[PDB]
Design a protein around this ligand. Structure first.
Ligand SMILES: Cc1cc2nc3c(=O)[nH]c(=O)nc-3n(C[C@H](O)[C@H](O)[C@H](O)COP(=O)(O)OP(=O)(O)OC[C@H]3O[C@@H](n4cnc5c(N)ncnc54)[C@H](O)[C@@H]3O)c2cc1C
Ligand SMILES: NC(=O)C1=CN([C@@H]2O[C@H](COP(=O)(O)OP(=O)(O)OC[C@H]3O[C@@H](n4cnc5c(N)ncnc54)[C@H](OP(=O)(O)O)[C@@H]3O)[C@@H](O)[C@H]2O)C=CC1
Length: 636
C-alpha cells in the first residue's frame, strides 16, 4: 500500500543516521572547563557574577554544619528549599545551605543569557510556583530575564538569600559512619587575583538538584585552540564582544563583522536570528539540522489568565498534566487542549517519554518490531509537516534541502521558531552543511569544511552541554562529584559495576540521607519543571514522614532488596526504549554509545508509562507512611 510504501522514509532516515556514526561516541566532545588550553577553559567562567558584592558578605566558615545541604540553586534546588520550608523541616537558621557554582540563583537561567533566549515550554506550565508567588508571566513563552527574575522572586519570597553559598564547586560528598553526617568538599571562587577558599561543610541530609545540561562542551575540532578571533560558548555569552546585554539585543559590535556559529540545536535556533540582524555576514555551521516547528509567541491576556489559566486552586499541576498527556500519547477524546501549542502535535514523542495507553512492550523481536512500526506510523504525519513547513519558508531549494531533518521526532529535542527558517532567506546568512560530518578543522583565521575554508572574525560555540545521560546516569558523574557512602563505598563504582540501583530514582542503598532528583529509573516529561515538581515533592514528603516517625532527626536508607526490586521493575520496561535504536546520534543515544550485560544496561532506563503514572505510583506509595523498603532509625 501507499501508507506502507511511504516507509522507504525509514530508508532515508537510516542513511542520514549512518552519515553521522562516530566510532568515538561521546569521545568527540570535551568539557570546556577541561580543555588543555587555559584561554579556552576560561570560556567556562561565570560572566555575570559580581565578585565585589559577594566578597563583601559574611563568608561561610570552614567546618560549618547544617540540617540540609542542597546542591543547586536553580528551579530544582529552589523547589526543594521551598518544599522543606512548607513541610516545616527548615525553620531554624542553619537548616538550609544551598550550594551552587553559579554566582547567584537560577541555575540554567543564571548561566544562559544569550540574545533571544526563551523557555521552549509554555511559561504558565514551566515557571514554578506561579500560584504561590502570585506572578503572572508576561507572555506565552518566557524570556531569560523574566526567568531569572522569577528565581529571585522565589528566593525572596522564601527568604533564601542568606542561605546560599555561590561560586562554589562541590567535589566530594562523603558519609562519616562515626558522626553520622555527610561532609562536602567545596571550593569557593573569590574573584580575579583572589585566592579560592577550600571549605568542608557538613549536613544530616544532602539533596542533589545538580541538573542535566550544566557543563558546556565543545567538539574536538583540530586546531580550534588556534583560531585568533574572539570565541565564546552560548552558555557563557560575551556581551563585550557582541555589544548589547542580557536585556539589550542590539548587538551593535557585530556590525561590519564576519560571525560564525557552530551548531543548530535549540540555542542556535533562538540566537541565529539575533546574530543575522547585526552581523555583516553570518555563517551557520551544521552537522545535523533541527526539526523546526512553529512557536506562536503571544502576550498574556488578562481575561484569558483568570478564565483559562489560573482557573482554580492547584491549577498549575493540572495544566502540566494536560500538556504532558499529548506527549505521552494519552490525550482523552474531547479533552480541552489547554496549552494548544506545537508540543501538542507530536504524539510520537511518547517513543522516548512513555505512554500509559499501550501496555508494556514484551521483549521478543516480533513485539519490538510491532512497537517500532506503531511509533514510526504515529510520527509520520507530524514529521512530514515539519519538512513541508521548511520547504515552504526557505526560498532557495538547496538551502531548504539542507535544513530538512530526516529522523523521527523523538530522536532530538524538538525546537520551535517563527523566525529561524526565514533567517536563511537573508542575503548575509549562509548555511554551511557538513554532510553529517561536522567541522573539519580550524585555523587562525577560521574553519575548514571539506577543504573549503571559511574565515571568521568572531566564533560562537552553540555546541551544547555534556549529555544528561553521562556515566550511565550515575548521579555522581552527572553532578561532577565523587560520592562515598557507608564503608567508603563509591556511588559511581556501584553504579558502573552492579548497574543503576535506586528506589523511585531518588536514593540508593549505602547512601543514607542522600537524595537526588530522579533521572535513571523513573520517568521524565518534556517539561522538566513537571519532573522536578513531582520529584522534589516525593523526596521532601518521604523525609517528612521519616522525621515525623522518629520525632525529628532521621536516618533514612533504602534497602538493597527494595532498590533491586525497583531495578528489576525498570528492566521490565526496557522494550519501550528500543524506540531509540534507529536514532541519529545525539545526547539521547549518547552519540550512538547507548550477553546479560544488556540487562545491566537496561537497569539505567525509565518506566515506560509516563509522568502521570509514575506520579500516581508515588502518591500511593506515600499514602500510609510505611515507607516500604526504607530502613528508618534515629540518626542520633
Ligand atoms: C539553554 C537551555 C534552555 C532550556 N529550556 C528549557 C525549557 O524550556 N523547558 C524545560 O523543561 N527545560 C529546559 N531546559 C532544561 C533545564 O536545565 C531545566 O528546565 C531546569 O532549569 C533545570 O533546573 P535544575 O535546578 O534541575 O538544574 P539547573 O538549572 O541546571 O541548576 C543546577 C545548578 O547546579 C550547579 N551545579 C551542578 N553541579 C555542581 C557541583 N558539583 N558543584 C556546584 N554546583 C553545581 C550548576 O552549575 C547549576 O548552576 C533548558 C536548558 C538549557 C541549558
Ligand atoms: C534546551 O537546551 C538543550 C541544548 O540545546 P543546544 O545548546 O542547542 O545544544 P545541542 O547539544 O542541542 O546542540 C549542539 C549542536 O552543535 C552541533 N555540533 C556538535 N559537534 C559539531 C561539529 N563537530 N560540527 C558542527 N556542529 C556540531 C550539534 O550537531 P549534532 O546534532 O549533529 O551533534 C548540535 O546541533 C536543548 O536540547 C534544550 O533542552
Amino acid at each position: 500500500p501507499e501508507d506502507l510504501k511511504l516507509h522507504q522514509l525509514s530508508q532515508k532516515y537510516t542513511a542520514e543516521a549512518a552519515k553521522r556514526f562516530r566510532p568515538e561516541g561521546l569521545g568527540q566532545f570535551i568539557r570546556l572547563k577541561e580543555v588543555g588550553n587555559e584561554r579556552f577553559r576560561a570560556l567556562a567562567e561565570d560572566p555575570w557574577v559580581d565578585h565585589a558584592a559577594l566578597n563583601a558578605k559574611e563568608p561561610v566558615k570552614d567546618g560549618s554544619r547544617y540540617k540540609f545541604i542542597i546542591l543547586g540553586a536553580g528551579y530544582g534546588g529552589l523547589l526543594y528549599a521551598v518544599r522543606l520550608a512548607e513541610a516545616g523541616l527548615a525553620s531554624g537558621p542553619d537548616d538550609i545551605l544551598m550550594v551552587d557554582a553559579a554566582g547567584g540563583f537560577g541555575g540554567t537561567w543564571w548561566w544562559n543569557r544569550y540574545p533571544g533566549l526563551h523557555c521552549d515550554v509554555e511559561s504558565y506550565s514551566y515557571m514554578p510556583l506561579l500560584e504561590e508567588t502570585g506572578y503572572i508571566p508576561k507572555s506565552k513563552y518566557a524570556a531569560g530575564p523574566e526567568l531569572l527574575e522569577h528565581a529571585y522572586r522565589i528566593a525572596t519570597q522564601w527568604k533564601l538569600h542568606d542561605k546560599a553559598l555561590f561560586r562554589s564547586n562541590v567535589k566530594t560528598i562523603r558519609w562519616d559512619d562515626e558522626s553520622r553526617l555527610w561532609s562536602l568538599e567545596v571550593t569557593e571562587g573569590r574573584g580575579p587575583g583572589q585566592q579560592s577558599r577550600e571549605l568542608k561543610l557538613q549536613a544530616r541530609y544532602v539533596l542533589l538538584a545538580s541538573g542535566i545540561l550544566t557543563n558546556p562542551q565543545v567538539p574536538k575540532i583540530p586546531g580550534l585552540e588556534t583560531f585568533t578571533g574572539p570565541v565564546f560558548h552560548t552558555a557563557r555569552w560575551n556581551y563585550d564582544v557582541t555589544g548589547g546585554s542580557p536585556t539589550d539585543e542590539a548587538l551593535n559590535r557585530l556590525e561590519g563583522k564576519r560571525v560564525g556559529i557552530i551548531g543548530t540545536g535549540a540555542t542556535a535556533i533562538q540566537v541565529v536570528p539575533k546574530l543575522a540582524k547585526y552581523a555583516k555576514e553570518l555563517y551557520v555551521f551544521q552537522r545535523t539540522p533541527s526539526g523546526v516547528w512553529w512557536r506562536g509567541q503571544r502576550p498574556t491576556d488578562p481575561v484569558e489568565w483568570k478564565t483559562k489559566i489560573a482557573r482554580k486552586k492547584g491549577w498549575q499541576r493540572e495544566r502540566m498534566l494536560n500538556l504532558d498527556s499529548y506527549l505521552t500519547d494519552a490525550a482523552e477524546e474531547g479533552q480541552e487542549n489547554m496549552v494548544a501549542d506545537g508540543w501538542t502535535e507530536m504524539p510520537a514523542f511518547s517513543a522516548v517519554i512513555g505512554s500509559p495507553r499501550h501496555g508494556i512492550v514484551e521483549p521478543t523481536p516480533e513485539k519490538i518490531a510491532e512497537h517500532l512500526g506503531r511509533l514510526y506510523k504515529l510520527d509520520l504525519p507530524h514529521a512530514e509537516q515539519v519538512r513541508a513547513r521548511t520547504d515552504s519558508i526557505v526560498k532557495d531549494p538547496k538551502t531548504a534541502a539542507k535544513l530538512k531533518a530526516w529522523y523521527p521526532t523523538w530522536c532530538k529535542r524538538p525546537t520551535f521558531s517563527d523566525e529561524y527558517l526565514q533567517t536563511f532567506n537573508l542575503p548575509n546568512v549562509h548555511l554551511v552543511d557538513t554532510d553529517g560530518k561536522g567541522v573539519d578543522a580550524a585555523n587562525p583565521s577560521g574553519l575548514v569544511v571539506a577543504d573549503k575554508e571559511y574565515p571568521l572574525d568572531i566564533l560562537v560555540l552553540s555546541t551544547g552541554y555534556v549529555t544528561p545521560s553521562i556515566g550511565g546516569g550515575s548521579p555522581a558523574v552527572r553532578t561532577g562529584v565523587d560520592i562515598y557512602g557507608r564503608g567508603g563505598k563509591s556511588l559511581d563504582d556501584k553504579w558502573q559495576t552492579h548497574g543503576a540501583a535506586t528506589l523511585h530514582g531518588v536514593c540508593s542503598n549505602g547512601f543514607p540521607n542522600l537524595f537526588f532528583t530522579p533521572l535513571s529509573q523513573s520517568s521524565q516529561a518534556a517539561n522538566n519543571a513537571f519532573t522536578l515538581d513531582v520529584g522534589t515533592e516525593h523526596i521532601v514528603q518521604v523525609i517528612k514522614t521519616a522525621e515525623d516517625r522518629v520525632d525529628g532527626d532521621a536516618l533514612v536508607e533504602v534497602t538493597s532488596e527494595a532498590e533491586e526490586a525497583w531495578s528489576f521493575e525498570i528492566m521490565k520496561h526496557a522494550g519501550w526504549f528500543a524506540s531509540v535504536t534507529g536514532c541519529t546520534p545525539g545526547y539521547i543515544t549518547s552519540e550512538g554509545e547507548a550477553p546479560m550485560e544488556m540487562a545491566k544496561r537496561a537497569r539505567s532506563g525509565n518506566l515506560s508509562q509516563g509522568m502521570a503514572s509514575y506520579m500516581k505510583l508515588l502518591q500511593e506509595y506515600r499514602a500510609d507512611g510505611s515507607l516500604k523498603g526504607f530502613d528508618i532509625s534515629s540518626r542520633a
